[PDB]
Amino acid sequence: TRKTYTLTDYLKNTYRLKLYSLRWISDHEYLYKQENNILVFNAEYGNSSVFLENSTFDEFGHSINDYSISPDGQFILLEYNYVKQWRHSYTASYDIYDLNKRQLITEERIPNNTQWVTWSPVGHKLAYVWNNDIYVKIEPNLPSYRITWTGKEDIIYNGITDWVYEEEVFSAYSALWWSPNGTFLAYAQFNDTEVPLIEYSFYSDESLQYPKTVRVPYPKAGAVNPTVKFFVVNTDSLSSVTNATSIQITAPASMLIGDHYLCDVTWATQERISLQWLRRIQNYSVMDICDYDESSGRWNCLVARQHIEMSTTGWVGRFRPSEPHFTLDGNSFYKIISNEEGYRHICYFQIDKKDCTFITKGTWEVIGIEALTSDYLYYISNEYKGMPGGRNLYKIQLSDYTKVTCLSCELNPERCQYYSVSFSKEAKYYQLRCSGPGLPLYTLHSSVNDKGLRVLEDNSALDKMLQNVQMPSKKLDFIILNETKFWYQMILPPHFDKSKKYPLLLDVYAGPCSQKADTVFRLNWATYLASTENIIVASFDGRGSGYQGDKIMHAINRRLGTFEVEDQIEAARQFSKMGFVDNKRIAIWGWSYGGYVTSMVLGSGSGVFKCGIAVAPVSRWEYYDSVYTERYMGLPTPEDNLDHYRNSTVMSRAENFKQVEYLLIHGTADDNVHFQQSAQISKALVDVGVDFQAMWYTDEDHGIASSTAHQHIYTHMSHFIKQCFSLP
Amino acid sequence: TRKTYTLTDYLKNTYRLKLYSLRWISDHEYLYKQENNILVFNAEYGNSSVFLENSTFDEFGHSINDYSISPDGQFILLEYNYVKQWRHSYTASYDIYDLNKRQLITEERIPNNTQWVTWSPVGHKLAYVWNNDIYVKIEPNLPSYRITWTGKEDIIYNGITDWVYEEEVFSAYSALWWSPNGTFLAYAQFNDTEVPLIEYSFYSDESLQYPKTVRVPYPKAGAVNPTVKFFVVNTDSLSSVTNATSIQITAPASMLIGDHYLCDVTWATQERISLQWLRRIQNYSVMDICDYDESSGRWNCLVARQHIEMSTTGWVGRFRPSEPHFTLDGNSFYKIISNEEGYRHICYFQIDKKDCTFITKGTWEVIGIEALTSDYLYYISNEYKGMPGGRNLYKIQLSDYTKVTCLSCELNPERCQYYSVSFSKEAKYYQLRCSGPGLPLYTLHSSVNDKGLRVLEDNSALDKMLQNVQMPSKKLDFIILNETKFWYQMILPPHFDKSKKYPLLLDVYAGPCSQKADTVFRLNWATYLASTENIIVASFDGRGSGYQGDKIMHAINRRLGTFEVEDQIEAARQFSKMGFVDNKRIAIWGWSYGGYVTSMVLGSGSGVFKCGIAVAPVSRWEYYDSVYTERYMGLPTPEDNLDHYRNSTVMSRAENFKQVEYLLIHGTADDNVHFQQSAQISKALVDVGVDFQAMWYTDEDHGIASSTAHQHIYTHMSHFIKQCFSLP
Ligand SMILES: N[C@H]1C[C@@H](N2CCn3c(nnc3C(F)(F)F)C2)CC[C@@H]1c1cc(F)c(F)cc1F
Ligand SMILES: N[C@H]1C[C@@H](N2CCn3c(nnc3C(F)(F)F)C2)CC[C@@H]1c1cc(F)c(F)cc1F
Ligand SMILES: *[C@@H]1O[C@H](CO)[C@@H](O[C@@H]2O[C@H](CO)[C@@H](O)[C@H](O)[C@H]2NC(C)=O)[C@H](O)[C@H]1NC(C)=O
Ligand SMILES: *[C@@H]1O[C@H](CO)[C@@H](O[C@@H]2O[C@H](CO)[C@@H](O)[C@H](O)[C@H]2NC(C)=O)[C@H](O)[C@H]1NC(C)=O
Ligand SMILES: *[C@@H]1O[C@H](CO)[C@@H](O[C@@H]2O[C@H](CO)[C@@H](O)[C@H](O)[C@H]2NC(C)=O)[C@H](O)[C@H]1NC(C)=O
Ligand SMILES: *[C@@H]1O[C@H](CO)[C@@H](O[C@@H]2O[C@H](CO)[C@@H](O)[C@H](O)[C@H]2NC(C)=O)[C@H](O)[C@H]1NC(C)=O
Ligand SMILES: *[C@@H]1O[C@H](CO)[C@@H](O[C@@H]2O[C@H](CO)[C@@H](O)[C@H](O)[C@H]2NC(C)=O)[C@H](O)[C@H]1NC(C)=O
Ligand SMILES: *[C@@H]1O[C@H](CO)[C@@H](O[C@@H]2O[C@H](CO)[C@@H](O)[C@H](O)[C@H]2NC(C)=O)[C@H](O)[C@H]1NC(C)=O
Ligand SMILES: *[C@@H]1O[C@H](CO)[C@@H](O[C@H]2O[C@H](CO)[C@@H](O)[C@H](O)[C@H]2NC(C)=O)[C@H](O)[C@H]1NC(C)=O
Ligand SMILES: *[C@@H]1O[C@H](CO)[C@@H](O[C@H]2O[C@H](CO)[C@@H](O)[C@H](O)[C@H]2NC(C)=O)[C@H](O)[C@H]1NC(C)=O
Ligand SMILES: *[C@H]1O[C@H](CO)[C@@H](O[C@@H]2O[C@H](CO)[C@@H](O)[C@H](O)[C@H]2NC(C)=O)[C@H](O)[C@H]1NC(C)=O
Ligand SMILES: *[C@@H]1O[C@H](CO)[C@@H](O)[C@H](O)[C@H]1NC(C)=O
Ligand SMILES: *[C@@H]1O[C@H](CO)[C@@H](O)[C@H](O)[C@H]1NC(C)=O
Ligand SMILES: *[C@@H]1O[C@H](CO)[C@@H](O)[C@H](O)[C@H]1NC(C)=O
Ligand SMILES: *[C@@H]1O[C@H](CO)[C@@H](O)[C@H](O)[C@H]1NC(C)=O
Ligand SMILES: *[C@@H]1O[C@H](CO)[C@@H](O)[C@H](O)[C@H]1NC(C)=O
Ligand SMILES: *[C@@H]1O[C@H](CO)[C@@H](O)[C@H](O)[C@H]1NC(C)=O
Ligand code: NA
């Protein structure tokens, strides 16, 4: 009898998924690390050489966390002393290695506690942020030129984002953008002077006598937001003037009338930059296209080149307005936007004409634009077989839109339905990354003829190991509600028998534009629960979920905590009707937005669920950040949406928790969903005399990802589920 | 057939003990509140009169928290807007009502947010503290005189104690001491300028968007301590034109050489005051006796009147140096101190004589001196029947110490073995308060011939109710360890059957000088556990426990976390050998110091306990406060006792928790034992891969006493214990 996928297998990662992460360094070569060696591969023939021997930094005296080669291949940036911060930010020490001279640069080194560093797109210029100010080095071993002097900890941020811009606007810590050939350096400055601070304790190692109080500018819903300014400096003039002037580009008058955000920066040409602004009420955005004026050294944005993007049914974009992709001459661009039917498709714009032309259409959506050449635009969409949870690469002829070729659909249809791609510098080659429904498969292709060059990684090793294991299966299907298809997936135990009644765990997220039903292959907790514990783990994408049009995504607009919660309850009822579910053993769990929905469901009084687990849940929208929260909920004021803000809390349903078994878990150093949110849920439950289980994770953040805490939490949750389901 | 004492009975206080709290106002009468009416009683006859009508303040507008009648009966201080702070501190609003003119005073009223107020011992002067400064009022309706001007929140405290002095030195918020007839007002001033602050979050009501950060000057072991100064001001010579002059009394040179504390202030006469000072290394204390010099208007303390008190085996006093009891002329005094055998007895001192004479002796201890007349000194001791957990009132003839008479021993030996007493102004009468083993009994007596005048409250109503309940019994006995007897008690289930095996729960505290085995009657969680769940709840007093001499009490000097922990394991080991104990079902629980011991026991690897519960436990002594910790542990420096500080932590024993079920509980707003202590325990358990149960209580402090949290924690612990014992 073959073994099953156990909890230890998951926690110890015994069955390792192999990947193939390469880095294109040109149009035909990429770097790949093999046995601590950095090899350089020739895409066309597959032959390689050692780019950097694994013994090169044997006596560096530090464990290098990452590396970065300058565009011209002349230098390499070594990143060590990695100190993680929020989702994208972190601190680290850096050194530069001269690849030619084979020597490490010892003079004019990058300061310690450098917040961010990036090479120019061409050559080897460097721009870094230290103590919240920007610095530029023209040459690795020469003195830096300071660009800003206003930097101030927790107050003024030059070239780097503050907490909310990093998490909800740019999904990056960096707030600087080199022009194409590196002449100009554009950047944002955030002023958090009046932004309130979230404060919480951090206990650290046992040796610390007094706990530390972490304080970070974080605007909760309705609070004072950071303000922002945008500047551009000509780095080619740094060595000619004592103090290069940073030219400011002000936001349009339509944004200056109230609170707003800078939400996108994209260079079009060497002398043209585009900027998108968004009003605090996120249903109105404006894009300016600004040109450099060589006579005045100023940047002007003609209103005739300004583009407006608004929404009547919801917010703009899936999570933010989409980025433009400019043609080489910078006179036109492509952008994904929802058409009249509510589906996101590619629209082609002339920079000085307000009406665009849609180049794709249908009841499906474009996920992203991956590359643009003079003749073709490549994009990922879920058009194939009408499966919103599948992803494929397409190519569309710019001179004939009716000519669309799917480059991945038929490669291996049974094994591969979820693709991501990585093109070489000029898109001469591309690596396809299939991530499901079968084992991940990595392949290399030539763009000139769209022919497969070779398989990079097929995971044959893992496929071998998994042969001796009773793996669960995955079903992806839909149910029809009110004339609309809603998708769901089920992780089914081995030897699934439709004549039996299995206990069911509903795995939920359900936030706006989420997708929990897809064709991706995962080896996770649910794998163990179905394989070893014979539990069916299901997920459902109801109203509010994405990639299926605005009618579904915008259904929860200004109404979080309603339809997405109700549809989750209805999904369980539907799974009951299927006949293979033990109606007495239905559970539900979720993390983050999922914890909120789980909590809301457990407190609904539906009687459908026996127990539930919420990990780091939101409990009341006024405790979460402004950018994310207000995007869907508007403002928490009586003139706007305060009533629904007050009606959608977990605390107001405390009394109904008397009907279920609940486990509440939260990391004490959660900078994202503050521990405060669970502190208020537990206090509300205590106040109405409701018993429940709880677990705090000291110094863990929203991810509860430290090695030990990760194993501990999944171990704790397993006992709770097994107990609720009366499982040995 | 009849009902048992349920968990609901404990939580809802179904069965209440009646009390009889009286307030002596003279040597012949006392005040007693009945039906919200304050009556005045004549001790000799028991007849009374209404002192103040309950309706008198029917339209007052505010809910009165407490009242305080001036010594002369002319005025009454009304307390309202009560807002609790730490163990003893709180702020409130006050109003004074004239009893003669039957009118509430409206001019020059005490400010709101007053920190402390007190009538002079005679007459009706008032002294109060507000905004950390002292004020005096000669007449209730007249303007007050500012005494101090240095008051500064969290920095300078005049007339009130800072956190550590409140909790560990004076067990009171007040740091004001009126002379016997009200002429002088002595006070202490604390300076916490360099004391680090403990910081933690307070979440408050759901409506608070951002958690508040509470900051409290709190010195952890080894940290910078507050400094102190002592002053005396003449309140009879206050001027409305000039600022009052306070005369400072400096500490002796033997104290000024290093860190020290003021630990006692006791007036001897109208013009003589005594102060005891304690070195930071708490085994050396000094008493100064100071006389007022009418010539210079200064206070002088003759070295010839200095009295040193030291210990070679441990610290000085039970928790601090005992207070002196001066004779009428103030020329001599009585004080409890450890004799050469290490037993605490009464010593008689001459103010200018170095040697004192012990007036009691034996292998038992005097608990406290209660009253002193020219012929007798009255005290409470545990001498009767050699039972350290029993308390009786005795009087000793000052002219012949061989004449000792027990005044409570034989009143009712079966019902009463634990007394407390309250004497009238000149010891003419005394109230005896028996609290066990039977139901509390309150009686009034006259000193001249020790007559038992009358029964004030015998709890006959409760007795009648408890007749219909299957109440548990209590066994108080002892076991021998190395020729030494150590006492224990067991709460035994109704109809106890020695032929059956009962699960056992060890209720532990075990801190230095603690006593958990006594003759006191209690209705608590243990009552329910034994009565309804049939669990034996035992407690044991091992090394380090009090009232049995220093040999036992000082055995843990500089060694906390050792013998007192080993002894609890030894006791349980012995109980597990008894025929009526199920050795497969033995648990342990404790709160505060008891939580620490429970945790150290559980992590000892003894294998005797199946499960355990720790509530707000200390986990590392360096996290607890200086005054308490250093008293027993010395300083945490390599030259002193750092090594034992480092290996007496719970965290270091994490690995040993693998074989036990552990429940860790802590309030997030605990200002005493910071949540930090439990946060470090959970992290250490997570780090070694040990699963456990936890529960935090949002905004609850060390007492977790709010009505809802109290019910919730005991409800939660009950489920844990029953589950551990496989009880329905
Ligand atoms: N704050 C939210 C940010 C969001 N991003 C989507 C886009 N993105 C991200 N990373 N990278 C990108 C992308 F590159 F796609 F832009 C994450 C993911 C969910 C996050 C979220 C939502 C909650 F309701 C909550 F309670 C806690 C929480 F954490
Ligand atoms: N900090 C300690 C103060 C102590 N006092 C004893 C004498 N006393 C008190 N109040 N009033 C009086 C008396 F009037 F008797 F003097 C309390 C009681 C135990 C307290 C304590 C000890 C710990 F190890 C701990 F971890 C937490 C904790 F809280
Ligand atoms: C991969 O192999 C190619 C050819 O197979 C290498 O190209 C070299 O091209 C130069 C042209 O001046 C010739 O002199 C060499 O003889 C070629 N090499 C070989 C092996 O024929 C290319 O350099 C190789 N790339 C890597 C990364 O190894
Ligand atoms: C960041 O924003 C703050 C406003 O919140 C600016 O501070 C003001 O500066 C003006 C001009 O010096 C002063 O008169 C005000 O007193 C300041 N207000 C506050 C609340 O501090 C600050 O100058 C901005 N910083 C930058 C670099 O733009
Ligand atoms: C480089 O130029 C900038 C901009 O003029 C200087 O920054 C100003 O500095 C003055 C005086 O220190 C302040 O009053 C202004 O508020 C600053 N403006 C800005 C935008 O920061 C900067 O000091 C100059 N650096 C040097 C070395 O001269
Ligand atoms: C990168 O682009 C910039 C901007 O177009 C180039 O700089 C201009 O170069 C022209 C010469 O062709 C000069 O007449 C202008 O004065 C320059 N303008 C600015 C703002 O510098 C730059 O030469 C390009 N860099 C490279 C390496 O080609
Ligand atoms: C309280 O005691 C003080 C001190 O003994 C009394 O004040 C003294 O009274 C005598 C006689 O009237 C004066 O000569 C002294 O100068 C006073 N000394 C001081 C320091 O004031 C006071 O009278 C007593 N109060 C009461 C109410 O009996
Ligand atoms: C009070 O206790 C302290 C500490 O136990 C004693 O001081 C010294 O403590 C160190 C260890 O910390 C020993 O090595 C010394 O032998 C102790 N004695 C001296 C003089 O330093 C101190 O002796 C105690 N005081 C009394 C009166 O017993
Ligand atoms: C208790 O009883 C005594 C005597 O029965 C009361 O009487 C004494 O005080 C009264 C006023 O307080 C006087 O009217 C009596 O003359 C006086 N009698 C004696 C012998 O002194 C006494 O007040 C009563 N006390 C209370 C508190 O009610
Ligand atoms: C309270 O104590 C502090 C010292 O703990 C006194 O100030 C002293 O310490 C300051 C720094 O902590 C020094 O800068 C000062 O020179 C020193 N002396 C003075 C007069 O400040 C402070 O004065 C004390 N306050 C009171 C009212 O006694
Ligand atoms: C302490 O606070 C109370 C409550 O504010 C004061 O009482 C008055 O309350 C009325 C209405 O509640 C207000 O109109 C007044 O402003 C308050 N003050 C006065 C003087 O009327 C009270 O007076 C305060 N006491 C002191 C000594 O400051
Ligand atoms: C590179 O270093 C690794 C150690 O991580 C070693 O095993 C390997 O043999 C080295 N590369 C080659 C080509 O030997
Ligand atoms: C960085 O700081 C470390 C720690 O003091 C020091 O050893 C090193 O010399 C510094 N390096 C640079 C480039 O500043
Ligand atoms: C944006 O949202 C607000 C609030 O719902 C609404 O009043 C306004 O009309 C919207 N603007 C657009 C362009 O739809
Ligand atoms: C005082 O009020 C109480 C209610 O609080 C009432 O029961 C009692 O009768 C009143 N006192 C008198 C003497 O009536
Ligand atoms: C009393 O002392 C304070 C503080 O030193 C001072 O401000 C005040 O004016 C003084 N009053 C008189 C009457 O001297
Ligand atoms: C005596 O008993 C104690 C515990 O009561 C034990 O620690 C000690 O080792 C025994 N022997 C001696 C000599 O103290
Ligand atoms: Na009697």
Side-chain angles (χ1 to χ4, degrees), chain A residues 199 206 210 213 218 623, chain B residues 199 206 210 213 215 218 623:
Chain A
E199 308 193 326
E206 185 189 338
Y210 285 89
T213 292
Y218 183 117
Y623 298 155
Chain B
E199 303 191 353
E206 190 188 322
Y210 286 88
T213 288
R215 305 193 170 74
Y218 181 115
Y623 297 156

PDB file of all heavy atoms in Angstrom, chain A residues 199 206 210 213 218 623, chain B residues 199 206 210 213 215 218 623:
ATOM      1  N   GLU A 199       1.153  51.702  16.192  1.00  0.00           N
ATOM      2  CA  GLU A 199       2.168  51.351  17.171  1.00  0.00           C
ATOM      3  C   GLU A 199       1.877  49.981  17.758  1.00  0.00           C
ATOM      4  O   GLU A 199       0.744  49.674  18.091  1.00  0.00           O
ATOM      5  CB  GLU A 199       2.215  52.409  18.286  1.00  0.00           C
ATOM      6  CG  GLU A 199       2.353  53.822  17.731  1.00  0.00           C
ATOM      7  CD  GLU A 199       2.718  54.852  18.785  1.00  0.00           C
ATOM      8  OE1 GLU A 199       2.282  54.701  19.924  1.00  0.00           O
ATOM      9  OE2 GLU A 199       3.427  55.825  18.474  1.00  0.00           O
ATOM     10  N   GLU A 206      14.909  36.871  23.544  1.00  0.00           N
ATOM     11  CA  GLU A 206      14.687  36.813  24.978  1.00  0.00           C
ATOM     12  C   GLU A 206      15.601  37.755  25.762  1.00  0.00           C
ATOM     13  O   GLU A 206      15.254  38.192  26.869  1.00  0.00           O
ATOM     14  CB  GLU A 206      14.906  35.378  25.423  1.00  0.00           C
ATOM     15  CG  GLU A 206      14.621  35.079  26.844  1.00  0.00           C
ATOM     16  CD  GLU A 206      15.085  33.672  27.210  1.00  0.00           C
ATOM     17  OE1 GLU A 206      15.228  32.832  26.285  1.00  0.00           O
ATOM     18  OE2 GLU A 206      15.290  33.412  28.415  1.00  0.00           O
ATOM     19  N   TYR A 210      13.408  45.294  27.718  1.00  0.00           N
ATOM     20  CA  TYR A 210      12.185  46.076  27.481  1.00  0.00           C
ATOM     21  C   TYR A 210      11.725  45.880  26.036  1.00  0.00           C
ATOM     22  O   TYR A 210      12.520  46.018  25.103  1.00  0.00           O
ATOM     23  CB  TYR A 210      12.445  47.568  27.731  1.00  0.00           C
ATOM     24  CG  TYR A 210      12.553  47.937  29.198  1.00  0.00           C
ATOM     25  CD1 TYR A 210      13.786  47.889  29.860  1.00  0.00           C
ATOM     26  CD2 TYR A 210      11.427  48.334  29.922  1.00  0.00           C
ATOM     27  CE1 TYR A 210      13.899  48.232  31.209  1.00  0.00           C
ATOM     28  CE2 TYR A 210      11.525  48.682  31.273  1.00  0.00           C
ATOM     29  CZ  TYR A 210      12.758  48.629  31.907  1.00  0.00           C
ATOM     30  OH  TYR A 210      12.855  48.978  33.233  1.00  0.00           O
ATOM     31  N   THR A 213       8.811  49.385  20.815  1.00  0.00           N
ATOM     32  CA  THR A 213       7.549  49.810  20.227  1.00  0.00           C
ATOM     33  C   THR A 213       7.799  50.203  18.768  1.00  0.00           C
ATOM     34  O   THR A 213       8.488  51.176  18.480  1.00  0.00           O
ATOM     35  CB  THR A 213       6.916  51.010  20.946  1.00  0.00           C
ATOM     36  OG1 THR A 213       6.495  50.613  22.256  1.00  0.00           O
ATOM     37  CG2 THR A 213       5.680  51.512  20.168  1.00  0.00           C
ATOM     38  N   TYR A 218       0.897  54.937   8.911  1.00  0.00           N
ATOM     39  CA  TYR A 218      -0.044  54.028   8.300  1.00  0.00           C
ATOM     40  C   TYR A 218      -1.400  54.684   8.383  1.00  0.00           C
ATOM     41  O   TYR A 218      -1.952  54.847   9.475  1.00  0.00           O
ATOM     42  CB  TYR A 218      -0.062  52.715   9.104  1.00  0.00           C
ATOM     43  CG  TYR A 218      -0.956  51.602   8.571  1.00  0.00           C
ATOM     44  CD1 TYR A 218      -0.412  50.382   8.152  1.00  0.00           C
ATOM     45  CD2 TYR A 218      -2.339  51.743   8.532  1.00  0.00           C
ATOM     46  CE1 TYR A 218      -1.225  49.327   7.716  1.00  0.00           C
ATOM     47  CE2 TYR A 218      -3.161  50.702   8.105  1.00  0.00           C
ATOM     48  CZ  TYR A 218      -2.589  49.493   7.699  1.00  0.00           C
ATOM     49  OH  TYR A 218      -3.395  48.463   7.295  1.00  0.00           O
ATOM     50  N   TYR A 623     -10.240  49.820  10.458  1.00  0.00           N
ATOM     51  CA  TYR A 623      -8.904  49.496  10.986  1.00  0.00           C
ATOM     52  C   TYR A 623      -7.899  49.225   9.854  1.00  0.00           C
ATOM     53  O   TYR A 623      -6.691  49.248  10.089  1.00  0.00           O
ATOM     54  CB  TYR A 623      -8.893  48.251  11.875  1.00  0.00           C
ATOM     55  CG  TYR A 623      -9.723  48.304  13.140  1.00  0.00           C
ATOM     56  CD1 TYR A 623     -10.196  47.119  13.713  1.00  0.00           C
ATOM     57  CD2 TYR A 623     -10.030  49.520  13.777  1.00  0.00           C
ATOM     58  CE1 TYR A 623     -10.953  47.125  14.879  1.00  0.00           C
ATOM     59  CE2 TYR A 623     -10.798  49.533  14.959  1.00  0.00           C
ATOM     60  CZ  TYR A 623     -11.255  48.325  15.497  1.00  0.00           C
ATOM     61  OH  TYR A 623     -12.023  48.298  16.649  1.00  0.00           O
TER      62      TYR A 623
ATOM     63  N   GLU B 199       6.194  49.795  27.699  1.00  0.00           N
ATOM     64  CA  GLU B 199       5.222  50.268  26.717  1.00  0.00           C
ATOM     65  C   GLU B 199       4.408  49.085  26.189  1.00  0.00           C
ATOM     66  O   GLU B 199       4.958  48.038  25.909  1.00  0.00           O
ATOM     67  CB  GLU B 199       5.957  50.978  25.548  1.00  0.00           C
ATOM     68  CG  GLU B 199       6.860  52.150  25.995  1.00  0.00           C
ATOM     69  CD  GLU B 199       7.394  53.040  24.848  1.00  0.00           C
ATOM     70  OE1 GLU B 199       7.210  52.721  23.660  1.00  0.00           O
ATOM     71  OE2 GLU B 199       8.016  54.082  25.150  1.00  0.00           O
ATOM     72  N   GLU B 206     -14.135  49.369  20.463  1.00  0.00           N
ATOM     73  CA  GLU B 206     -14.081  49.129  19.043  1.00  0.00           C
ATOM     74  C   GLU B 206     -14.005  50.433  18.259  1.00  0.00           C
ATOM     75  O   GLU B 206     -13.436  50.476  17.172  1.00  0.00           O
ATOM     76  CB  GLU B 206     -15.334  48.361  18.649  1.00  0.00           C
ATOM     77  CG  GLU B 206     -15.345  47.816  17.262  1.00  0.00           C
ATOM     78  CD  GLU B 206     -16.713  47.251  16.902  1.00  0.00           C
ATOM     79  OE1 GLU B 206     -17.355  46.642  17.786  1.00  0.00           O
ATOM     80  OE2 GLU B 206     -17.132  47.408  15.737  1.00  0.00           O
ATOM     81  N   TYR B 210      -7.128  53.844  16.118  1.00  0.00           N
ATOM     82  CA  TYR B 210      -5.726  53.511  16.346  1.00  0.00           C
ATOM     83  C   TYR B 210      -5.504  53.132  17.804  1.00  0.00           C
ATOM     84  O   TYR B 210      -5.869  53.889  18.695  1.00  0.00           O
ATOM     85  CB  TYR B 210      -4.815  54.712  16.060  1.00  0.00           C
ATOM     86  CG  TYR B 210      -4.621  55.029  14.592  1.00  0.00           C
ATOM     87  CD1 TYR B 210      -5.501  55.879  13.919  1.00  0.00           C
ATOM     88  CD2 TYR B 210      -3.558  54.483  13.879  1.00  0.00           C
ATOM     89  CE1 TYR B 210      -5.318  56.177  12.568  1.00  0.00           C
ATOM     90  CE2 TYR B 210      -3.367  54.774  12.533  1.00  0.00           C
ATOM     91  CZ  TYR B 210      -4.239  55.616  11.879  1.00  0.00           C
ATOM     92  OH  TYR B 210      -4.016  55.929  10.554  1.00  0.00           O
ATOM     93  N   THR B 213      -0.859  53.636  22.953  1.00  0.00           N
ATOM     94  CA  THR B 213       0.334  53.043  23.548  1.00  0.00           C
ATOM     95  C   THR B 213       0.457  53.552  24.994  1.00  0.00           C
ATOM     96  O   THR B 213       0.611  54.748  25.238  1.00  0.00           O
ATOM     97  CB  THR B 213       1.640  53.414  22.791  1.00  0.00           C
ATOM     98  OG1 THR B 213       1.684  52.736  21.536  1.00  0.00           O
ATOM     99  CG2 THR B 213       2.875  52.969  23.607  1.00  0.00           C
ATOM    100  N   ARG B 215       2.433  53.976  28.432  1.00  0.00           N
ATOM    101  CA  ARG B 215       3.841  54.054  28.835  1.00  0.00           C
ATOM    102  C   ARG B 215       3.915  54.252  30.346  1.00  0.00           C
ATOM    103  O   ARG B 215       3.334  55.197  30.876  1.00  0.00           O
ATOM    104  CB  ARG B 215       4.533  55.219  28.109  1.00  0.00           C
ATOM    105  CG  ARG B 215       4.396  55.144  26.580  1.00  0.00           C
ATOM    106  CD  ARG B 215       5.332  56.114  25.866  1.00  0.00           C
ATOM    107  NE  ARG B 215       5.359  55.856  24.424  1.00  0.00           N
ATOM    108  CZ  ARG B 215       4.382  56.168  23.564  1.00  0.00           C
ATOM    109  NH1 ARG B 215       3.259  56.768  23.983  1.00  0.00           N
ATOM    110  NH2 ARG B 215       4.529  55.870  22.271  1.00  0.00           N
ATOM    111  N   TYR B 218       8.729  52.002  34.800  1.00  0.00           N
ATOM    112  CA  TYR B 218       8.771  50.714  35.476  1.00  0.00           C
ATOM    113  C   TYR B 218      10.185  50.156  35.399  1.00  0.00           C
ATOM    114  O   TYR B 218      10.652  49.807  34.313  1.00  0.00           O
ATOM    115  CB  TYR B 218       7.777  49.790  34.743  1.00  0.00           C
ATOM    116  CG  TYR B 218       7.611  48.381  35.266  1.00  0.00           C
ATOM    117  CD1 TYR B 218       6.383  47.958  35.802  1.00  0.00           C
ATOM    118  CD2 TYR B 218       8.654  47.457  35.201  1.00  0.00           C
ATOM    119  CE1 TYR B 218       6.205  46.645  36.254  1.00  0.00           C
ATOM    120  CE2 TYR B 218       8.485  46.137  35.646  1.00  0.00           C
ATOM    121  CZ  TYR B 218       7.260  45.741  36.163  1.00  0.00           C
ATOM    122  OH  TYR B 218       7.078  44.431  36.530  1.00  0.00           O
ATOM    123  N   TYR B 623      12.657  40.257  33.502  1.00  0.00           N
ATOM    124  CA  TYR B 623      11.504  40.982  32.970  1.00  0.00           C
ATOM    125  C   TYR B 623      10.648  41.562  34.074  1.00  0.00           C
ATOM    126  O   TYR B 623       9.812  42.422  33.804  1.00  0.00           O
ATOM    127  CB  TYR B 623      10.587  40.091  32.122  1.00  0.00           C
ATOM    128  CG  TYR B 623      11.187  39.511  30.860  1.00  0.00           C
ATOM    129  CD1 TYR B 623      10.658  38.343  30.305  1.00  0.00           C
ATOM    130  CD2 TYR B 623      12.249  40.142  30.190  1.00  0.00           C
ATOM    131  CE1 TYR B 623      11.151  37.817  29.131  1.00  0.00           C
ATOM    132  CE2 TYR B 623      12.757  39.614  28.998  1.00  0.00           C
ATOM    133  CZ  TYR B 623      12.202  38.451  28.478  1.00  0.00           C
ATOM    134  OH  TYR B 623      12.693  37.887  27.327  1.00  0.00           O
TER     135      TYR B 623
END
